[PDB]
Design a binder for this molecule. Structure first.
Ligand SMILES: C=CCO[C@@]1(C(=O)O)O[C@H]([C@H](O)CO)[C@H](O)[C@H](O)[C@@H]1O
Ligand SMILES: [Mg+2]
Lengths: 217, 221
């Protein structure tokens, strides 16, 4: 049996209703038990999946009213009446009428009001420098939306090589993102220059947020 | 209290084999079918197979994708489930979960995986197991943001805790990045300036594949 889910992902604002679909290539209705063998699981980032709905429409112990499973045969749906911040997760349907098969999942994301990042810059530690490396980190905290740009400048000149960027998952409490931008040099590279600057550009303003430091301080 | 705990994860060379274990307690083991599920990083869950309960004769079934390559068995005296993996390739790199399946022959029967283990990460690579280096992130107002930069480890994953788990609010941990065969990430925490440096802030960085934990106390410049 092939399971297919839709959409692959979607974003809604808190308080809004959401509908996700799950289709199977064969009927999941067991004629003997007269039940649809389809389950919905919730998997939050970094966590194991958690059973929400079984037999297509029955809610597992502890799961809130807000989650409703429906459908029969080959077409199934998971409805969330009012999505909240804790709902950030991928939702998987799973047939168990013939062995078991998981759908491809639907990622639920949250839309929220735009928010500017708080920007911090961190010079390299002495223990890294001692080992001959110099990582400079620009941290952008609690912003939205996700897309954001960091420009690095050394002694006033832009620097593109040696930079790595990485985002957090959407925050389960306030729906914001954070990201780090790391410029990695050798100790010698680092000690050849003085001024280190990172500029954060985000839709929350025309002007970039600029943070800097001087190696000789 | 139902418990499922997977072990045996880590780095394995391509072509080699690996046995996973899943220790259980808090229920009558022999009453339940037991399933294995895996999940490649950033991908969907995939059911691999199950072994049935005692009433059904502990018979095994598997998905097409792993038929003839993955094998399942159970020690009914110790209540331990196993997954035997053979001829592993990079595509098999994934988190492997065990899950309690149905008990249709005694007690409460409903179709679903009521309990799951925490999962164990297997990565199939010809590379080298290397513990991370941990560096403090400290500034050059009413709040201060600190953290640890974790670099040069392999394979995944690492977990970062603050003050041995006692500092949990305002924690941000960015996803790992792979560059030149090594992983790195950074974890940061924001606390009131009245708490640091006047009080202790420490990050604990655990790297399961090397059985290593590193501590880094955050000190002022
Ligand atoms: C006591 C019946 C067990 O029946 C099993 C089984 O073992 O094979 O089969 C059931 C099918 O619906 C039968 O058509 C379910 O898949 C069930 O989960 C289980 O896999
Ligand atoms: Mg068979």
């Amino acid at each position: 049996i092939v399971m297919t889910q839709s959409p692959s992902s979607l974003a809604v604002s808190a308080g809004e209703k959401v509908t996700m679909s799950c289709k199977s290539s064969q009927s999941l209705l067991n004629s003997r038990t007269r039940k649809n063998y389809l389950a919905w699981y919730q998997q939050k980032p970094g966590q194991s999946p958690k059973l929400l709905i079984y037999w297509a429409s029955t809610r597992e112990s502890g799961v809130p009213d807000r989650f409703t499973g429906s459908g029969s045969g080959t077409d199934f749906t998971l409805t969330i009446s009012s999505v909240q911040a804790e709902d950030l997760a991928v939702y998987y349907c799973k047939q168990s009428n013939n062995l078991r098969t998981f759908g491809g999942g639907t990622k639920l994301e949250i839309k929220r009001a735009d928010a500017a990042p708080t920007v911090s810059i961190f010079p390299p530690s002495s223990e890294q420098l001692t080992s001959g490396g110099a990582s400079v980190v620009c941290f952008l905290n609690n912003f939205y939306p996700k897309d954001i740009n960091v420009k690095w400048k050394i002694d006033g000149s832009e620097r593109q090589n040696g930079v790595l960027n990485s985002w957090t998952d959407q925050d389960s409490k306030d729906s914001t993102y954070s990201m780090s931008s790391t410029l990695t040099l050798t100790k010698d590279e680092y000690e050849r220059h003085n001024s280190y600057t990172c500029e954060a550009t985000h839709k929350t303003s025309t002007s970039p947020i600029v943070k800097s430091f001087n190696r000789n301080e | 209290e139902v418990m499922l705990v997977e072990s045996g994860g880590g780095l394995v060379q391509p072509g080699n084999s690996l046995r996973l274990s899943c220790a259980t307690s808090g229920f009558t083991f022999t009453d339940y079918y037991m399933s294995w599920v895996r999940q490649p990083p950033g991908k969907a869950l995939e059911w691999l197979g199950f072994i049935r309960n005692k009433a059904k004769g502990y018979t095994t079934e598997y998905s097409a994708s792993v038929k003839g390559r993955f094998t399942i068995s159970r020690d009914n005296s110790q209540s331990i489930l196993y997954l035997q993996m053979n001829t592993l390739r990079a595509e098999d790199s994934a988190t492997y979960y065990c899950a309690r399946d149905i008990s249709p022959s005694y007690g409460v029967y409903y179709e679903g995986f009521a309990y799951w283990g925490q999962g164990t990460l297997v990565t199939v690579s010809a590379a080298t197991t290397t513990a991370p280096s941990v560096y403090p992130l400290v500034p050059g107002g009413s709040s201060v943001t600190l953290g640890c930069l974790v670099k040069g480890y392999f394979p995944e994953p690492v977990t970062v805790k603050w003050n041995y788990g006692a500092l949990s609010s305002g924690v941000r941990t960015v996803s790992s990045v792979l560059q030149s065969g090594f992983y790195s990430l950074s974890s940061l925490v924001t606390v009131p300036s009245s708490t640091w440096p006047s009080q202790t802030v420490i990050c604990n960085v655990a790297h399961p594949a090397s059985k290593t934990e590193l501590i880094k106390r955050i000190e002022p410049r």
